[PDB]
Design a protein around this ligand. Structure first.
Ligand SMILES: [Zn+2]
Lengths: 132, 25, 221, 56, 217, 101, 83, 71, 129
RNA sequence: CAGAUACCGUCGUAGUUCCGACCAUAAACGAUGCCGACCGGCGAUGCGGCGGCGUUAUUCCCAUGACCCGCCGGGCAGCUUCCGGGAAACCAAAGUCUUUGGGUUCCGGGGGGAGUAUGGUUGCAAAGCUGAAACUUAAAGGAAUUUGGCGAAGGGCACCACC
RNA sequence: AGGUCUCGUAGACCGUGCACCAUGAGCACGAAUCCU
C-alpha cells in the first residue's frame, strides 16, 4: 500500500516543528517550501514529505498532535494551566461532616467548629459488589 | 516392550517352568 | 586517551577532592566507571585469566559459538574482584571481563588465630559462600600454614591477600564459574559479619555528595 | 564511516574457514554502493595454499 | 515536627482537609497502615487521623529542607491527576519534575540522555508508580510517597497518609508540602498568610475546561 | 514434571468421585475432571423464528428453549475446539472467556 | 581491629543500621542514609545542624522502614510524643 | 542420623551394619562367591599353558583385529 | 509432643533475631532457660528479660538487640570432660576469639571459660556467638 | 488393509448384581511418614461460639430461622511476595541445614541381569511376602532456553500452490 | 387537541465426528590470546 517510512515521517515532523508560519494547506506551496529550506536529493521523497506535511497540518488545525510541539499551541496550554478562580473552591460557606470523624475531631484538638454540621448515617451497611 | 506386558510374559514363562518342574518328578 | 566522567562521582574523583575508595566503600556507592579503580589502584592491580569456556547456540544452519572468559583481579594486600564476559571472539571477551572485574572489587578484612601479634594473615571467621550447588567454606588457620585448597581458590586467595586458610568445598566443583563465584561470595561476605570486636555504636559522617555539592554545582549542570 | 575486512582460505587447519571483521557502517544494495565503497580482491601465496582478501 | 507550638494546624488547615476530603480513604486496608487509621465508619470507608498526617508531612518537609541543593529533589508523577501539581511544586521549591512517562533506566543507565542522579525522591502513588521505586532501590536513594490506605507500603521511608484518588486532595497535599518546605527554607514568612491560591495544583478534565471557557471569557 | 498446581481436576479431599460418560465418545471420565458446557439453545435459531411467529394460532407466543448439559472428555473437548492450549503464564487463569452478547 | 599493641589495623569501620543494628555492606545498594533537618525553637527555621539515620537494605526490601524512621524520630524528639 | 538419643547405639550400629552390607564394592570383597568365580583365586599373577592363538575384534567405533590367546 | 523446652526457646529467639524483631515470647519457662539467658545477658548479647508469672508456667519476653548471630542446642546432653572440650570448641565455634559453649556443671550453669579456670566439666547445653 | 486373528459395525459365553467362603494386589499418588514449636499479608469458604446499625417470617416486645458487618478455634483449598530453600520446575513448606543435633519408624547407594534362580512361607487355584549371584556396560538419568518436526493450534503469503 | 413516543440495529453460533497413509544401514565434526 502507501505507508510512509522513518525518513519521511521524521523529516516532516522536524520541518513542522521548526517551521509553521511558512507552511500551509496547499500541497504545491509547502512542496516549494520543502524544496527551498530542506536539502532533498530526490523528488519522490520531496513529494512524500510535502504530502505528509499537508496531512499533518490537516490534523493540527483540527486538534492537538502528541508527536510534535509548535509555539502557537504551546503556551495556550500554560494559559490554560495558569488560571485562577474567584472563589478558592475550598473555603465554602458550609462543609458536610460525618458523625464518626466529628467525634474524631472532638478528641483531636477542638470541641466545636463554626462551619460544620453533623449529617445522619445510613440505615444499613451494603458497600461491596456481589462477588461471594 | 513396555513393563506390563513384559511382566505378563515372564509370568507365563514362570508358569510353564513350574508346570515342567512339577511334571519332571 | 582522556577521561570524560559521566557520573558526578567520577568528576569528584578526577578533580582530586576524595582521599581513598574506602569512603566510597563505607557509603556503599555504586561504581560504574571501571578506571576510577585504575586511578586509585595503580601497578599493584594484576589479573590472571581463569578459564575460557566456549558456549554454543544452535541456529538455522550450524551452531553459533561464543567464548566466555573468566578473569580475577586484585592487589595482593587488600581488594579482590571477579568478572565474567561472553562475546564473539576471545580478545574482546577478555577485555570486557577485565573491565567487569575492575568494576566490582570488594574489600577484605583479615583476623588472627589466637594471639593478635603483628599484621593479620587469616580469615577472621568461618565464612561461607553459596551459588549453584558449590558450597565453599573458609576456616582460619595458624601462621605459616599456607592456602590449602583447590588451585582456583588458592590463586584467588593469594590474589586477595589472605595468606593462611583452611578450605572445604562440596558439590560439583568441576564447573569453574560456580566454583569461582562461590569462593568470591565466601570472601566478599567477610565484612558482613557482626563480631564483638566492633560492637561500639558508630558515628555517621557526612556523605561526599552533600559536602562537595558546592563543587558539583560550580563545575557542572 | 565504516570498513569490512574478511580473510578467506585455510587458517591453522586442513578445513577452510572464513573470519569476517566488520565495524561501522556498510551498505550493500542500491546504486549508492557503486560510488561510495571501493572493493579490492587480492591473493596471498602462502606455503600451504592461497589466501583470499576482500576489503571494502 | 510538631513538638513545638508553632508547627500545628490552627483553624484553616483542618477546614481545607475537610473540604478536600483527605480524611476519607479506600475500602481496603494494608497491614502497615493500621497506625494511620482512627476508625472505620459506615459504608466501608476508613478515616485517616489528621494529626498523624500533619506529623508525617512535617517530617517529609524536614527531609526535603535537610539537603541544601534544591535541584537534587526529583518529583515524579505519571497519572493525569497530579500532572500540574508536580510542575508547580518544582516551580516553587526548585525541584526537578518528571510528569508523564517515567522511562526506565534513568537512574541506572548513564548513556541515556535523561540520566538523572538525585538525592531525594518524591512520588505520588506507590501502587501506580512501582517503576521509580525499583530504580530508586537499585542505587542508594531514599524516597517520599503520598500513600493511601491500601497502597503497597514497600521501599518507602516517609509515608504520608492521604487521599490520592481525588484531584483536590492531591493538589492540597502538594500545596501544603510546598508551603511547609518554603517556610522551613525561610523564603516565606510564617505569620503572614501565604494562602494566595491553592487551586493552581488542581487538575480538571477537559469537559470542565470547555465548560469553564464557555462560562467565562 | 508437574504441569499444574492441581492435577487437571478439582479433587482435593475425596480420593474417589463418580465417573461419568462423554457425549461424543463413551469414555468413562471422572465428574470433576470432564469439561462441562451447559448450553441454552432455542428450538428455531435465527430465521425460522419469524416463520413460526407469522404463521401461528396464538398471538404473542414465546418460543420455548432447549436445555442440555454436555459432558466432554479432554481429548474430545480439544478435538471439538472447545478448549485450546495456552501459554505457561496464561495457564493459571481460571476466569471464563469473555462474552459480547 | 586491634592487637596486643592496641593499634588499629582494619581498613574501615563499616556503618551499622540504625533500625536493626546490622552491618551495612559495601555492595548493599538498597541501603540509604537519611538526613533529617531540625528547626529553631521560636522562629522556626533551619538552624544548620543534621540528624542522620541509616536503614539497611533488608528493612527497605521488607518494606517496614517508615515505622523504624518514625520510631527513631520519636526517640530523638522530632515527632511529638502523643502523635 | 535419624535415631538421635543418648542410649541409642545398638540401633545405629545394626542399621549401619545392614546398610554397609547393602552395597556393591564392600559386598564383592566379603562374599566367597566373587572369589571362587574369579579364575585367579585372589592372586595377582597366574601361570598357564597356551592352547591356541585366537583373533578377536574391536567394538563399534574403531576397527582392528586385537590378537589374543586361549590359556 | 513437646520434649525439650530450651530447644524451642532458642529456636524462637533465633527466628525472631533473623526476622529483625525487637521482642519475643517464649511460652514455657524453666530454670535452665533463665540461667542460659542470664549467661547470654551477662556476656552482653541480649537485654533485660521479663518473666511473666502465672500459676502454670511462666512466659519470658527478652529485649532483643542487634547483637546476636545464632543460638542453638546440642541434643542429647552429651557429657564432656576437660580433655574433650577442645574438640567441641574447635568443631562448633567460628573463631578462637569469641563465642561461648554453655555447659551444665556441678558448680552451676556456666560457660566453657570459667569451666576451664574452675577445673571442672559436665554435660553440654548449647552455644551462641 | 498388501496382510488385520487390530481401530469400526451385528450377535454373544464367563463376568457385571445379591448372599456365603477365599487372595491381599493398583499411577492404593499430595509420586511429599507421624507428633510438637516458630517465622508475612489478603479476600472468600464449611462447622461451632460471641458481638453489633438495619431488612424479612407483614407493622409493638423477646428468643429464634434467613440476610448485612466483624472476631475467635479446628478443617479442604486459593492469590501475591528478593522471608527463606532448591540443580531448577517450584514450595508458606519442600523454610528455620557448613551459623550442620526437637523426638521417632520405614527405606536408596551407576545402569542391566532382576523382583530373576534356589530355599522358606501363605493360598483350592491364579498368585502374594521374603529375595541373590555369575556375567556385562560408561553411561542410564532430573530441570530449562533458542533453529527440529507434529496426520498440534491460532494469524498471514505465493499461479515455481490451488480454485 | 396532537397521531408510527425516543436513541443504533453483527437481525453472524445448522451441524457433529471426518477413508487409506509402512520404511530410511551410514561412513562426515576442527573447540582458541597478546600488540610499539
Ligand atoms: Zn468422548
Amino acid at each position: 500500500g502507501r505507508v510512509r517510512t522513518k525518513t519521511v515521517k521524521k523529516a516532516a515532523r522536524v520541518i513542522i516543528e521548526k517551521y509553521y508560519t511558512r507552511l500551509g494547506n496547499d500541497f504545491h506551496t509547502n512542496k516549494r517550501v520543502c524544496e527551498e529550506i530542506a536539502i532533498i536529493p530526490s523528488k519522490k521523497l520531496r513529494n512524500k514529505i510535502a504530502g505528509y506535511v499537508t496531512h499533518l497540518m490537516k490534523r493540527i488545525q483540527r486538534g492537538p498532535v502528541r508527536g510534535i510541539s509548535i509555539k502557537l499551541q504551546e503556551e495556550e496550554r500554560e494559559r490554560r494551566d495558569n488560571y485562577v478562580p474567584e472563589v478558592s473552591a475550598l473555603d465554602q460557606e458550609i462543609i458536610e461532616v460525618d458523625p464518626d470523624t466529628k467525634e474524631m475531631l472532638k478528641l483531636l484538638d477542638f470541641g466545636s467548629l463554626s462551619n460544620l454540621q453533623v449529617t445522619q448515617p445510613t440505615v444499613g451497611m451494603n458497600f461491596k459488589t456481589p462477588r461471594g | 516392550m513396555r513393563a506390563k506386558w513384559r511382566k505378563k510374559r515372564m509370568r507365563r514363562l514362570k508358569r510353564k517352568r513350574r508346570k515342567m518342574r512339577q511334571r519332571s518328578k | 586517551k582522556e577521561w570524560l566522567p559521566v557520573t558526578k562521582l567520577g568528576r569528584l574523583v578526577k578533580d582530586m577532592k576524595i582521599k581513598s575508595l574506602e569512603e566510597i566503600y563505607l557509603f556503599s556507592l555504586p561504581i560504574k566507571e571501571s578506571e576510577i579503580i585504575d586511578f586509585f589502584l595503580g601497578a599493584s592491580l594484576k589479573d590472571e585469566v581463569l578459564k575460557i569456556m566456549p558456549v554454543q547456540k544452535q541456529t538455522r544452519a550450524g551452531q553459533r559459538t561464543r567464548f566466555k572468559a573468566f578473569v580475577a583481579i586484585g592487589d595482593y594486600n587488600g581488594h579482590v574482584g571477579l568478572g565474567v564476559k561472553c562475546s564473539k571472539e576471545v580478545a574482546t571477551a577478555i577485555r570486557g571481563a577485565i573491565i567487569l572485574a575492575k568494576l566490582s572489587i570488594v574489600p577484605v578484612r583479615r583476623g588472627y588465630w589466637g594471639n593478635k601479634i603483628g599484621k593479620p594473615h587469616t580469615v577472621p571467621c568461618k565464612v561461607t559462600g553459596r551459588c549453584g550447588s558449590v558450597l565453599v567454606r573458609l576456616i582460619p588457620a595458624p601462621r605459616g600454614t599456607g592456602i590449602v585448597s583447590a588451585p582456583v581458590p588458592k590463586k584467588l586467595l593469594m590474589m586477595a591477600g589472605i595468606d593462611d586458610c583452611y578450605t572445604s568445598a562440596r558439590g560439583c566443583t568441576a564447573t569453574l564459574g560456580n566454583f569461582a563465584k562461590a569462593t568470591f561470595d565466601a570472601i566478599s561476605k567477610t565484612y558482613s559479619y557482626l563480631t564483638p570486636d566492633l560492637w561500639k555504636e558508630t558515628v555517621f559522617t557526612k556523605s561526599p555528595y552533600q559536602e562537595f555539592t558546592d563543587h558539583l554545582v560550580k563545575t557542572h549542570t | 564511516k565504516g570498513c569490512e575486512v574478511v580473510v578467506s582460505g585455510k587458517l591453522r587447519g586442513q578445513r577452510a574457514k572464513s573470519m569476517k571483521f566488520v565495524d561501522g557502517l556498510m551498505i550493500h544494495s542500491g546504486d549508492p554502493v557503486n560510488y561510495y565503497v571501493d572493493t579490492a580482491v587480492r591473493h596471498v601465496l602462502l606455503r600451504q595454499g592461497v589466501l583470499g582478501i576482500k576489503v571494502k | 515536627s510538631g513538638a513545638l507550638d508553632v508547627l500545628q494546624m490552627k483553624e484553616e488547615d483542618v477546614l481545607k482537609f475537610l473540604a478536600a476530603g483527605t480524611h476519607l480513604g479506600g475500602t481496603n486496608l494494608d497491614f502497615q497502615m493500621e497506625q494511620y487509621i482512627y476508625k472505620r465508619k459506615s459504608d466501608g470507608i476508613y478515616i485517616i487521623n489528621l494529626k498523624r498526617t500533619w506529623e508525617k508531612l512535617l517530617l517529609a518537609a524536614r527531609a526535603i529542607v535537610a539537603i541544601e541543593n534544591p535541584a537534587d529533589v526529583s518529583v515524579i508523577s505519571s497519572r493525569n491527576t497530579g500532572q500540574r501539581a508536580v510542575l508547580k511544586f518544582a516551580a516553587a521549591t526548585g525541584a526537578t519534575p518528571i510528569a508523564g512517562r517515567f522511562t526506565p533506566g534513568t537512574f541506572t543507565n548513564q548513556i541515556q540522555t535523561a540520566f538523572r542522579e538525585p538525592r531525594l525522591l518524591v512520588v505520588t502513588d506507590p501502587r501506580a508508580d512501582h517503576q521509580p521505586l525499583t530504580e530508586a532501590s537499585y542505587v542508594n536513594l531514599p524516597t517520599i510517597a503520598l500513600c493511601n490506605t491500601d497502597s503497597p507500603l514497600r521501599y518507602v521511608d516517609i509515608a504520608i497518609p492521604c487521599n490520592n484518588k481525588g484531584a483536590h486532595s492531591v493538589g492540597l497535599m502538594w500545596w501544603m508540602l510546598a508551603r511547609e518546605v518554603l517556610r522551613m527554607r525561610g523564603t516565606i514568612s510564617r505569620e503572614h498568610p501565604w494562602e494566595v491560591m491553592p487551586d493552581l495544583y488542581f487538575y480538571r478534565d477537559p469537559e470542565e475546561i470547555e465548560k469553564e471557557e464557555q462560562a467565562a471569557a | 514434571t508437574k504441569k499444574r498446581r492441581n492435577n487437571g481436576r478439582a479433587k482435593k479431599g475425596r480420593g474417589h468421585v463418580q465417573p461419568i460418560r462423554c457425549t461424543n465418545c463413551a469414555r468413562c471420565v471422572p465428574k470433576d475432571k470432564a469439561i462441562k458446557k451447559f448450553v441454552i439453545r432455542n428450538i428455531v435459531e435465527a430465521a425460522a423464528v419469524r416463520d413460526i411467529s407469522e404463521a401461528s394460532v396464538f398471538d404473542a407466543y414465546v418460543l420455548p428453549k432447549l436445555y442440555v448439559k454436555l459432558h466432554y472428555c479432554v481429548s474430545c473437548a480439544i478435538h471439538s475446539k472447545v478448549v485450546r492450549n495456552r501459554s505457561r503464564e496464561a495457564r493459571k487463569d481460571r476466569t471464563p472467556p469473555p462474552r459480547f452478547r | 581491629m586491634q592487637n596486643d599493641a592496641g593499634e588499629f589495623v582494619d581498613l574501615y569501620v563499616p556503618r551499622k543500621c540504625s533500625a536493626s543494628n546490622r552491618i551495612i555492606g559495601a555492595k548493599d545498594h538498597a541501603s540509604i542514609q537519611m538526613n533529617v533537618a531540625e528547626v529553631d525553637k521560636v522562629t522556626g527555621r533551619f538552624n544548620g545542624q543534621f540528624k542522620t539515620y541509616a536503614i539497611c537494605g533488608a528493612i527497605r526490601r521488607m518494606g517496614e522502614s517508615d515505622d523504624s524512621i518514625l520510631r527513631l524520630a520519636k526517640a530523638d524528639g522530632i515527632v511529638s510524643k502523643n502523635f | 542420623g535419624k535415631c538421635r538419643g543418648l542410649r541409642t547405639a545398638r540401633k545405629l550400629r545394626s542399621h549401619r551394619r545392614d546398610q554397609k552390607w547393602h552395597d556393591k564394592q564392600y559386598k564383592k570383597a566379603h562374599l566367597g562367591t566373587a572369589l571362587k568365580a574369579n579364575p585367579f583365586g585372589g592372586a595377582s599373577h597366574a601361570k598357564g599353558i597356551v592352547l591356541e592363538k585366537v583373533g578377536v575384534e574391536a567394538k563399534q567405533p574403531n576397527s582392528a583385529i586385537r590378537k589374543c590367546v586361549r590359556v | 509432643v513437646r520434649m525439650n523446652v530450651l530447644a524451642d526457646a532458642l529456636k524462637s529467639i533465633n527466628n525472631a533475631e533473623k526476622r529483625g524483631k525487637r521482642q519475643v515470647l517464649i511460652r514455657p519457662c524453666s530454670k535452665v532457660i533463665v540461667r542460659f539467658l542470664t549467661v547470654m545477658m551477662k556476656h552482653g548479647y541480649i537485654g533485660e528479660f521479663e518473666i511473666i508469672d502465672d500459676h502454670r508456667a511462666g512466659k519470658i519476653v527478652v529485649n532483643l538487640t542487634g547483637r546476636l548471630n545464632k543460638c542453638g542446642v546440642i541434643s542429647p546432653r552429651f557429657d564432656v570432660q576437660l580433655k574433650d572440650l577442645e574438640k567441641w570448641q574447635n568443631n562448633l565455634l567460628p573463631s578462637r576469639q569469641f563465642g561461648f559453649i554453655v555447659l551444665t556443671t556441678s558448680a552451676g550453669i556456666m560457660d566453657h571459660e570459667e569451666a576451664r579456670r574452675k577445673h571442672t566439666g559436665g554435660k553440654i547445653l548449647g552455644f551462641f556467638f
